[PDB]
Amino acid sequence: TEYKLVVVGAGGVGKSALTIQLIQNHFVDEYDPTIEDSYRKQVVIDGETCLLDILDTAGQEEYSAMRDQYMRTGEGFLCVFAINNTKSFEDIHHYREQIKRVKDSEDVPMVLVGNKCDLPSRTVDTKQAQDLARSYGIPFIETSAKTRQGVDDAFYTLVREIRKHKE
Ligand SMILES: Nc1nc2c(ncn2[C@@H]2O[C@H](COP(=O)(O)OP(=O)(O)O)[C@@H](O)[C@H]2O)c(=O)[nH]1
Ligand SMILES: [Mg+2]
């Protein structure tokens, strides 16, 4: 089965770098922040094959209805912030609200991702992010697209969350 995964978060948090590690096994140092693209990858998770369709978002669309549409078709959401950027963490509150609002749903599969854990000047404590995820009933995973810490776990965990919702 094909699953639609959507990677959301503020500009610069590492959405593209996380996605390209999973898809292409390398860490990109410069990927235009304004490009939005999708990637397909066949995988096996918990013994069951599936086709991932991963949308690496980049923010505003020509029409806001198009952003609403990809949230409606999206089955699970990787909500990414950067651990050195408090505003990107605060934005998670808005992503949670907006995705639920567009889907008109109280139960939306999501994983909270705190990326850039290899960088200095952390401003978001592990506990603060874990507590937020727990308040939503979703997993929290610390990642680094540079070292590949957590990357594969984040995406595979999101598929598990999608299946738990559908099952
Ligand atoms: N050190 C480090 N750099 C990262 C990490 N993730 C992304 N970057 C870099 O941070 C910048 C923004 O990443 P990008 O994936 O383009 O962010 P996006 O705007 O969310 O798609 C780029 O220079 C990436 O190489 C990370 O986990 N660690
Ligand atoms: Mg990007």
Residue numbers in the entry: 2 to 168
What does the literature reporting this entry say, word for word?
In the active state, RAS proteins interact with a variety of effector proteins, such as RAF kinase, PI3K, and RalGDS, leading to activation of downstream signaling pathways. The role of magnesium as an essential cofactor for small GTPases is well established as it is required for both high-affinity nucleotide binding and GTP hydrolysis. To examine the effect of N-terminal modification on the tertiary structure of KRAS, we carried out structural studies on KRAS constructs containing iMet (unprocessed N-terminus), lacking the iMet (partially processed N-terminus), and KRAS lacking the iMet and with N-acetylation of the second amino acid (fully processed N-terminus).
Toward this end, we expressed and purified N-terminal processed KRAS (lacking the iMet with N-acetylation at the nascent N-terminus) using an insect cell expression system. Mass-spectrometric analysis confirmed the cleavage of the iMet and N-acetylation of T2. We attempted crystallization of N-acetylated KRAS (2–169) in both GDP and GMPPNP bound states; however, we could only obtain crystals in the GDP-bound state which diffracted to a resolution of 1.00 Ang. In the structure we see clear electron density for the N-acetylated threonine and the Mg2+ present in the nucleotide binding pocket. The acetyl group interacts with residues Q43 and T50, in the β2 and β3 strands, via water mediated hydrogen bonds, which stabilizes the N-terminus in a similar fashion as the iMet in case of Mg2+-bound KRAS (1–169)-GDP structure. Structural data presented here show that the N-acetyl group and the iMet play a similar role in stabilizing the N-termini and the central β-sheet of their respective proteins, N-terminally processed KRAS (2–169) and unprocessed KRAS (1–169).
